[PDB]
Amino acid sequence: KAFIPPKEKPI
Amino acid sequence: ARGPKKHLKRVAAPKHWMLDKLTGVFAPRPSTGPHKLRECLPLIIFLRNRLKYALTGDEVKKICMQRFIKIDGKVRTDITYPAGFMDVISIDKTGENFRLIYDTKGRFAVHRITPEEAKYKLCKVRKIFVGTKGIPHLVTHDARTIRYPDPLIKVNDTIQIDLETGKITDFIKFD
Amino acid sequence: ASKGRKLRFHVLSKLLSFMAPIDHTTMNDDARTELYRSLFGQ
Amino acid sequence: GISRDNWHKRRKTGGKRKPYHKKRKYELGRPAANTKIGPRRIHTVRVRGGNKKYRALRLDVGNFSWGSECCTRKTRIIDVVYNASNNELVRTKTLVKNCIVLIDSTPYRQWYESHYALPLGRKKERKKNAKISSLLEEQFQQGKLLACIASRPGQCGRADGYVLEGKELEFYLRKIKARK
Amino acid sequence: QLIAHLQVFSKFSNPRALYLESKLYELYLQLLLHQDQMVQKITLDCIMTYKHPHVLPYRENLQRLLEDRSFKEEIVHFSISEDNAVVKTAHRADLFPILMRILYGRMKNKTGSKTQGKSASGTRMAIVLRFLAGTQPEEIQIFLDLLFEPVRHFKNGECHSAVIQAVEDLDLSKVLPLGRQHGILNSLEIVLKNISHLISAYLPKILQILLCMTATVSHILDQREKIQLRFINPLKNLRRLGIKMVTDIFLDWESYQFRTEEIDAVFHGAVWPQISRLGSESQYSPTP
Amino acid sequence: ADIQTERAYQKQPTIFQNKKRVLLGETGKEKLPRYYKNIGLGFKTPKEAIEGTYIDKKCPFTGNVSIRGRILSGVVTKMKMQRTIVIRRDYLHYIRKYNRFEKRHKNMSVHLSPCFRDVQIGDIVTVGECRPLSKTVRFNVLKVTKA
Amino acid sequence: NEVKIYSLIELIQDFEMPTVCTTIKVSKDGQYILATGTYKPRVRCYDTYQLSLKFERCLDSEVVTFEILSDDYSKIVFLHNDRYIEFHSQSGFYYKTRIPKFGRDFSYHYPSCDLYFVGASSEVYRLNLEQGRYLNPLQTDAAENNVCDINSVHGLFATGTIEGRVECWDPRTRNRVGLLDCLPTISALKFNGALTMAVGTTTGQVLLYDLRSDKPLLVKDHQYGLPIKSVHFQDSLDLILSADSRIVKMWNKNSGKIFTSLEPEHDLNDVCLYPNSGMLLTANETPKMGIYYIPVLGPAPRWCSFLDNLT
Amino acid sequence: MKLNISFPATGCQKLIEVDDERKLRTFYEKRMATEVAADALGEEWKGYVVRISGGNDKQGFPMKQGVLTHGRVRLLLSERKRKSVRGCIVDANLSVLNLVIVKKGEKDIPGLTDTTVPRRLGPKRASRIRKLFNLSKEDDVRQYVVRKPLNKEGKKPRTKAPKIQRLVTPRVLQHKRRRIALKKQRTK
RNA sequence: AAACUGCGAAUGGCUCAUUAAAUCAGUUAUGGUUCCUUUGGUCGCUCGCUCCUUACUUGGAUAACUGUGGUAAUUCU
RNA sequence: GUGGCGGCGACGACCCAUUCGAACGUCUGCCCUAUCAACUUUCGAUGGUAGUCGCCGUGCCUACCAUGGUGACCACGGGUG
């Protein structure tokens, strides 16, 4: 879990 | 400890000094010297407690500054000078000589010696090493180092040193 | 992963709200996309 | 500050320990001396006991020993080619212990020519033994010799070493060739 | 008093227009060999008044040679070898007469931070000659003429004749000083060791100088009854060094063609004076 | 096999290996002189340590370490690290209150020089005290006797 | 060559790093000038009005480059050769963190609070600053990346590569808008205006690039082979300043006419121009920091207004 | 605005209050340690040249050479503290300005140069005495010691001379001889 | 008197704001390190291009002191 | 005669030894809690090579490597006028 990359969404 | 302590408490003094309990909080901390702190007898203790020549510390200082006490043939003015085993003390004003020898109970004893006996002392050989220019050197128990010793002398042997010259006269082998 | 060799995505407490987003862009958003499409020989 | 203490480390079993004291003076550390190549610039540092440490920041010359010929000569340093610890020191030209450097070969050539009276580096009752391996001859033709630094520039302030020869020489040559 | 005179001449804009300027330049060149630093730096200023196009650009490097702190660094960073040189090839002819005389003065007095005293004399000679090893055989000749100046009188004449006439023209009242003679041999030993590859042309006259002094010292060593006792030990040391260098020259230079006169000279000054008594000395240790 | 397995050149520091020689001596044998020392205390240096070719600075016989202090013995338990093993020492601890004993054990990480070979699980090892070689290693292997 | 550059009594006292000066920079307000150097790596801030140093802060390791995030001296970010990123508040040291691989250079995007790390990895690290969490990586597909720059006009990010190719990315949506091809690596990369771009090479060439045309508008070649570290733009006279270790060259943007050249005694680690002034600040391999004033280029700075009278 | 003028050749100081702005205008907008021809001061000051040594502003803060400003700054001065110092540029907002006369003019100032202030103390080290009196090695330094006559009311007249230091006396030679003897004894 | 130089203040006191082999007790090692003071040693030169007639002692400064001063303001200057 | 020899002290001084210590290690031995059974690699945990720093030995630290280390013989965690 510590190495899973976060995913961001374009606002 | 954070730093070295310069105040020797009376209860932490060596038990062979025969100090009583209600004199005071402190005991004379011996100055650094030829003998270890735990195996030495300070000049003030020998001069005011053993011989009863002095009453107070200022009294011991007044005695010492007159250059009356000689330790191993040399005048010592430090009242906390560490005197140890096989040491010769001369007081010419009282015409008296002492040699510090352990007694059967494990304490330094007031042993009077004949003035011809006070001309020499015995030392235990601690170290043998070759110095600069191939000059042999011998180191004793009382921090005395001597150049050009007899080749037959090894570690744990005993040597007789003449106090006037500081040279080896003869030796006893460990056997 | 030893000595932080592998990147980790835990939240940093001290870095939270260290700066505020401040933007001064003269180009409008429509102009930027048209410029980006036509960059270099493209 | 830089501390090189031991109580900030985890235990052998893996548990962490909590401090009982603040940092002490005798556990201090100092910033590293990244010795570059350039005009001589050395700083002195007062250390515990009142002694001195010579912190060489920039060096360009040093004495190196030709062990086979037993010829110690003072020559300038040109470049850093190999470092076992890290390649970044090779990039930044940092002088540390056991790094491989290139030195000028002029004094060694002069000594050889004055001693054996044979030409060297030129373009196309035991007696004296003037025999040199092909690798050293090639390096002398190139004009630069490979050397290994034996002293610590950040501690003594000087960069001394020895000329690479033999099994070590082809080992390092192979390492340099494989790196490219 | 000399510094006072030199200072005013350093502040002259056009030294060429000065009267008797030709003799002034000769005086300045002689003063470059001086041992004192303050004499040398003020003399260099007078030379730089002549804004010679070749000497002038290397002014800063010359001054750092005259500074105690920056001498050793300047030696490395003022390379004169033809492969890599700071000085250009066209400028070598003009710069070298200035350079050699400055280095000769430093060699006598001081060539670094810790190089002072009679004990460090060998270190001083070594440092200069390694720097001069990169020069051509023509350019090194200027320095060797300065080094062997007191013994020029041994050079003239043929090899065998020079050895013989030196013995005859010997007076116990006046000789070259033994201390200076010891300096000549120590300097000459260092020269043969380090610049032997630039010495082939000048080698035959070295044999003349070396043999003549060795022959003379043996002559006083025969006449011990007329000399002081304290002088005996330095003379024996002088003879020992002379034979050792002849031993060195024979050990190397295998292909060198020795003339007949030189073979006569070596027996006159080295072999015959001691060969008769060789059974007496060699038994304890091998004599030179 | 091959002793050059690291990024740096492995060499025995006190031996000079670039001495130039005549061709007749080179034709004979290129045998490097080995360095080894007598450690004292009655222990004998192994033979294959004398004619070996391994490089180990922590070797008690061919490295720069000194043996002084306490001499202990144990049973070898684990060989899984590089040149270091884990041994076990068993003993009995006495409690006065109930007047009996309890069994206790200690685990010790000790360095092996590559000299000692044919070492298995459960054989007796005699080890000696030396300077700290790592975080947890302070003893070196001196003698191996089979089970 | 009729420019008569002067050299400087003491404008700011103790403008002296102990041995060398690595990087010299100025704040947006112009109030504070910041310098770093060896030995005992320091950050020294000099107030222009007081003509003295405000403070000195020692650091563990040498700083390759630093960026002044705040308008004033409060917030500073340091990049270290030990892979360390140090944040300094107005009080002092605030926090320190590591980067997975060594960092060559970094740039900060003021919109979105994203700071980009270019270093010894193919990927370029992104650190969001409003939330402390590291953001998603972007893969440049190049073995080594040397330099990076962000355009202020329209927010365009370009990273230099060791192969010699400039790759342009978009801070929004994190996609590669374009790529540019041009043996020597990219020493210096600089954005000026909306449409003008400059590429530095280790061989010693300055190439001016237009975003729309692949071919360079003009090329200027330094005769020395030394790499050019810094490229700067001066808007009023349209002068482009290219600096290398040996010398500093100032030449016109169009037709490449040379304004003047300054050669100092020691090599330049960095150069800086005070905004809207002829004053030039240089960092050298010398305990002193060089200060030069060019009357022709611009007027004297306000805090040094009397310098015009002194000339 | 006051001027403290000193003549070092005679060593005389004088404080003059000049209320004329026209006279002080010539000193305005000039830096310290610069040579100024003070002709505007008056008819007595013709051909005189002065050097600006220092001064104090209306709040009593002194001037420092390095700083270049018209006002006050806070610099680290001597373990260094942030003291406030006035800039070196001379302005009209100065309480006092110091001047040192370097070149003498035609006429003489009635305060400074007509009278002479003598030096009060002679040299004490032997070599400095020899240099001052151009003594050779053979001349005796003890003969050339400057004696100070001193008299007070109710006291006998007296004359005192300083003790010569670095003077060769037999005691020092005996000490050197003893050191050489100790070296000989050690070798023996 | 004043001023310059040297030594000590890190010990004894006192104090409301931390802690399970982390401290602590006993043994054991310095051949893996540091050291003010005490004590004992050690502490001379042949020649070696520096030439001719400082080792009977070589150089440059600065306090105390004299005198002129500025400000609401320091023993600030 | 700018002769030659000298006594008893004071102060300072390179190095060796001694004294007073200081600092890192080896071995032996700690209270309650299992309704804490697993832990360490959660910015090095174990070991190897080279190096930085440090008074010195050492993951003390950094680069490149292997997957190690401890545990019911109670590790690890939590407590404990």
Chain CA centroid to CA G268, Å: 13
The C-alpha atoms of residue F110 and residue F90 are separated, in whole angstroms, by 16
The phi, psi pair for B59, rounded to 5°, reads -60, -45
The C-alpha atoms of residue G180 and residue G189 are separated, in whole angstroms, by 13
Domain count, chain D: 3
By the 8 A CB rule, do G18 and D31 touch? Answer: no
Helix (H) or strand (E) holding B71: strand B69-71
Helix (H) or strand (E) holding E265: helix E260-266
Which own/partner contact pairs does E160-165 have at CB distance under 8 Å and 24+ positions apart? E160/E261, E160/E262, E160/E264, E160/E265, E160/E268, E161/E261, E162/E208, E162/E211, E162/E212, E162/E265, E163/E208, E163/E211, E163/E212, E163/E215, E163/E265, E163/E268, E163/E269, E164/E268
Query: Is the CB of residue B57 inside 7 Å of nucleic acid strand I?
Result: no
Query: Is the CB of residue E187 inside 7 Å of nucleic acid strand I?
Result: yes
Q: Helices E37-49 and E2-10: crossing angle, nearest 10°?
A: 30
Residue F111 tokens, joined: 């360095």
Binary contact (A6, C9; C-beta < 8 A): yes
The closest alpha carbon to G26, from G228, G273, G240, G267, belongs to G273
- Residue at G99: amino acid letter: I
Contact of H67 with chain G, judged by CB distance below 8 Å, is answered with yes
The closest alpha carbon to G240, from G283, G268, G198, belongs to G198
Number of helical (H) and strand (E) elements in chain D, helices listed first: 5, 10
By the 8 A CB rule, do H124 and H167 touch? Answer: no
Which nt has its C1' nearest the CA of B78? I38
Q: Helices E92-109 and E137-147: crossing angle, nearest 10°?
A: 30
Residue G282 tokens, joined: 């240089």
By the 8 A CB rule, do G92 and G57 touch? Answer: yes
Work out the number of other CB atoms within 10 angstroms of the CB of residue F117: 9
Q: How far apart are the first and last CA of chain F?
A: 29
Residue G185 tokens, joined: 């690596």
The residue written with tokens 């190196």 in the block is D64
In F20-130, alpha helices (H):
23-28, 47-50
- Rounded to whole angstroms, what are the CA distances from G112 to G67, G69, G128, G163, H11? 17, 13, 8, 30, 72
By the 8 A CB rule, do G62 and G81 touch? Answer: yes
Same domain, residue pair D93 and D149: yes
Which CATH number, 3.40.640.10, 3.10.290.10, 1.10.1130.10, 3.40.50.720, labels domain B1-116?
Answer: 3.10.290.10
| Chain discontinuities in chain H, listed by preceding residue (C to N exceeding 2.5 Å) | 78
Residue B159 CB burial class (10 angstroms; 0-12, 13-18, ≥19): buried
By the 8 A CB rule, do F60 and F111 touch? Answer: no
Residue G137 tokens, joined: 């990586």
The C-alpha atoms of residue H123 and residue H146 are separated, in whole angstroms, by 8
- Residue D123, domain extent: 106-143
The C-alpha atoms of residue B70 and residue B43 are separated, in whole angstroms, by 11
Bond into G39 cis (ω within 30): yes
The C-alpha atoms of residue G110 and residue B61 are separated, in whole angstroms, by 80
The C-alpha atoms of residue F91 and residue F74 are separated, in whole angstroms, by 11
- Rounded to whole angstroms, what are the CA distances from B75 to B46, B60, B94, B96, B144? 16, 15, 15, 15, 17
Distance in Å, residue D8 CA to nucleotide J38 C1': 24
Contacts of D141 by beta carbon, 8 Å cutoff, 6+ apart? D121, D123
The closest alpha carbon to D53, from G39, F97, F30, belongs to G39
By the 8 A CB rule, do G242 and G206 touch? Answer: yes
The C-alpha atoms of residue G293 and residue G300 are separated, in whole angstroms, by 8
Pairing of strands G176-181, G165-169: antiparallel
The C-alpha atoms of residue G81 and residue B60 are separated, in whole angstroms, by 67
The residue among G113, G125, G136, G170 with the most chain A CBs within 10 A of its CB, best to mutate, is G136
Pairing of strands B82-83, B41-42: antiparallel
By the 8 A CB rule, do F106 and F76 touch? Answer: no
The residue written with tokens 């003879």 in the block is E239
| Helix/strand/coil for E132 | helix
Which nt has its C1' nearest the CA of B1? J22
Contact of H75 with chain G, judged by CB distance below 8 Å, is answered with yes
The C-alpha atoms of residue G27 and residue G70 are separated, in whole angstroms, by 9
CATH number at residue D125: 1.10.168.20
Give residue limits of the domains in chain F.
Answer: 1-147
The C-alpha atoms of residue B35 and residue B14 are separated, in whole angstroms, by 14
By the 8 A CB rule, do B120 and B162 touch? Answer: yes
CA atoms within 13 A on the CB side of E271: 8
The C-alpha atoms of residue E105 and residue E36 are separated, in whole angstroms, by 8
Indicate the resolution in Å. Answer: 3.6
Q: What angle do CA B91, B92, B98 make, to 5 degrees?
A: 40
By the 8 A CB rule, do G155 and G109 touch? Answer: yes
The C-alpha atoms of residue G78 and residue G81 are separated, in whole angstroms, by 10
The C-alpha atoms of residue G26 and residue G149 are separated, in whole angstroms, by 18
The C-alpha atoms of residue D60 and residue E73 are separated, in whole angstroms, by 10
DSSP string for residues in chain H: -EEEEEETTTTEEEEEE---HHHHHTTTT--TT-EEE-GGG-SS-SS-EEEEEEEE-TT-PBB-SS---SSEEEEEE---EEEEEE-SS--S--SEEEEEEEE--SS--TTTTSS---------BHHHHHHHHT--SSS-GGGGPPPEEE--TTS--EEE-PPPBS---HHHHHHHHHHHHHHHHHH-
Q: Helices E37-49 and E21-31: crossing angle, nearest 10°?
A: 150
Binary contact (D110, E73; C-beta < 8 A): no
The C-alpha atoms of residue E152 and residue E145 are separated, in whole angstroms, by 9
| Helix/strand/coil for E57 | helix
Contacts of D76 by beta carbon, 8 Å cutoff, 6+ apart? D60, D61, D103, D104, E76
| Helix/strand/coil for D112 | helix
Chain G residue whose CA is closest to H32: G9
Biggest distance spanned by C-alpha atoms of chain E:
72
| Helix/strand/coil for F107 | strand
Contact of H76 with chain G, judged by CB distance below 8 Å, is answered with yes
Residue H70 CB burial class (10 angstroms; 0-12, 13-18, ≥19): middle
Query: Contacts of residue F16 in chain D, CB cutoff 8 Å?
Result: 67
The C-alpha atoms of residue F64 and residue F54 are separated, in whole angstroms, by 14
- Residue at F64: amino acid letter: N
Same domain, residue pair D78 and D152: yes
By the 8 A CB rule, do G36 and G53 touch? Answer: no
User: How far does D127 lie from chain G, in Å, by closest CA?
Assistant: 50
By the 8 A CB rule, do G18 and G37 touch? Answer: yes
The closest alpha carbon to E143, from E152, E127, E132, belongs to E132
The C-alpha atoms of residue E105 and residue E98 are separated, in whole angstroms, by 11
By the 8 A CB rule, do H109 and H44 touch? Answer: yes
Neighbour order of strands in the sheet with G123-128: G103-109, G114-119, G123-128, G138-139
The C-alpha atoms of residue H125 and residue E105 are separated, in whole angstroms, by 36
User: How far does G214 lie from chain D, in Å, by closest CA?
Assistant: 31
In chain B, alpha helices (H):
43-45, 57-64
Chain CA centroid to CA E125, Å: 9
The C-alpha atoms of residue B40 and residue B52 are separated, in whole angstroms, by 19
User: How far does G235 lie from chain H, in Å, by closest CA?
Assistant: 30
The closest alpha carbon to G67, from G39, G102, G103, belongs to G103
Q: Are there at least 3 beta-carbon pairs closer than 8 Å between C and G?
A: yes
The C-alpha atoms of residue B117 and residue B97 are separated, in whole angstroms, by 9
The C-alpha atoms of residue E85 and residue E97 are separated, in whole angstroms, by 17
By the 8 A CB rule, do E211 and E266 touch? Answer: yes
Chain CA centroid to CA G75, Å: 17
The C-alpha atoms of residue G78 and residue G88 are separated, in whole angstroms, by 8
By the 8 A CB rule, do H145 and H129 touch? Answer: yes
The C-alpha atoms of residue H73 and residue H83 are separated, in whole angstroms, by 8
CA atoms within 13 A on the CB side of G298: 19
By the 8 A CB rule, do G60 and D2 touch? Answer: yes
Q: Are there at least 3 beta-carbon pairs closer than 8 Å between E and A?
A: no
The C-alpha atoms of residue G244 and residue G253 are separated, in whole angstroms, by 18
Query: Contacts of residue A5 in chain C, CB cutoff 8 Å?
Result: 9
The C-alpha atoms of residue E172 and residue E222 are separated, in whole angstroms, by 12
User: How far does G205 lie from chain D, in Å, by closest CA?
Assistant: 21
In G2-46, alpha helices (H):
none
Which of E73, E252, E253 lies closest to D40 in CB terms? E73
Contacts of B66 by beta carbon, 8 Å cutoff, 6+ apart? none
Distance in Å, residue B6 CA to nucleotide I10 C1': 12
Binary contact (G306, H69; C-beta < 8 A): yes
| Helix/strand/coil for D21 | coil
The C-alpha atoms of residue F85 and residue F122 are separated, in whole angstroms, by 12
The C-alpha atoms of residue H124 and residue C36 are separated, in whole angstroms, by 87
The C-alpha atoms of residue G191 and residue E39 are separated, in whole angstroms, by 60
The C-alpha atoms of residue G160 and residue G140 are separated, in whole angstroms, by 10
The C-alpha atoms of residue B99 and residue E221 are separated, in whole angstroms, by 67
By the 8 A CB rule, do H9 and H108 touch? Answer: no
DSSP string for residues in D61-85: EEEEEETTTTEEEEEEEEEEEE-SS
Biggest distance spanned by C-alpha atoms of chain F:
80
Residue B142 tokens, joined: 């009382």
By the 8 A CB rule, do E148 and E156 touch? Answer: no
CA dihedral G200, G202, G203, G204 (to 10 degrees): 40
The C-alpha atoms of residue G305 and residue G299 are separated, in whole angstroms, by 9
Q: What is the DSSP letter of B10?
A: G
By the 8 A CB rule, do B72 and B89 touch? Answer: no
By the 8 A CB rule, do G293 and G22 touch? Answer: no
Q: What angle do CA H89, G27, G186 make, to 5 degrees?
A: 125
Fold of the domain spanning F1-147: OB fold (Dihydrolipoamide Acetyltransferase, E2P) (2.40.50)
The C-alpha atoms of residue E135 and residue D106 are separated, in whole angstroms, by 12
Nucleotides on chain I that have an atom closer than 7 A to a protein CB are: 10-12, 18-23, 28-32, 34-51, 56-60, 64-74, 76-77
| CATH 2.40.50.740 corresponds to the domain B121-171 | yes
By the 8 A CB rule, do D31 and G39 touch? Answer: yes
Torsion over CA: D128, D132, D138, D142 (sign): negative
Same domain, residue pair D78 and D136: no
Distance in Å, residue E127 CA to nucleotide J8 C1': 52
Beta bridge partners of B100: B110
Q: Left if phi > 0, otherwise alpha if psi is -120 to 50, otherwise beta: which for H176?
A: alpha
